[PDB]
């Protein structure tokens with residue numbers, strides 16, 4: 001798992017996100033959708049977004065970004081003790097949304113990218129290490145739930 005020092009770094013970085021949850025959420029989803037157009041197809045309600053300008057102008061996309069990052073923030077603040085929070089998310093993503101774990105890898109990478117893009121020179125090597133560990137733990141615990149369900153895609 002993560003050390004206490006690493007968790008402290010994770011939650012310090014997260015303060016940056018909390019100052020502008022909607023803006024961070026929007027940028028994360030736009031990074032995801034533009035880098036990996038197949039991901040947009042999992043969202044019946046975002047399929048109409050044919051350009052990045054349309055994505056940027058979408059208030060509902062910002063809303064979803066807020067929902068996503070709020071859930072992730074709640075999980076991170078549990079510092080790994082997140083079974084109750086994570087299980088239902090894993091299960092809704094496997095059974096209802098059909099989100100392959102690959103897409104969770106994509107969004108994890110997007111979060112790291114957005115942190116650097118919005119805070120260049122202010123997301124240090126130690127902080128990236130810690131946040132990466134936290135996102136890997138999140139993804140890995142979801143992966144265990146996916147395996148339980150036999151879900152691949």
Ligand code: HEM
Pocket residue numbers: 039040042043044045067068069071072088089092093097099103104107
């Ligand atoms: C940090 C990772 C993610 C978190 C914390 C997260 C969180 C959430 C939450 C809280 C909801 C609403 C409740 C629910 O349905 O369980 C949701 C809905 C949804 N998510 Fe995720 N999500 C993540 C990643 C992804 C990815 C990578 C995709 C697709 C590539 C995705 C696709 C969807 C879809 C299609 C819905 C339903 C949207 C709607 O039509 O209202 N999610 N997500």
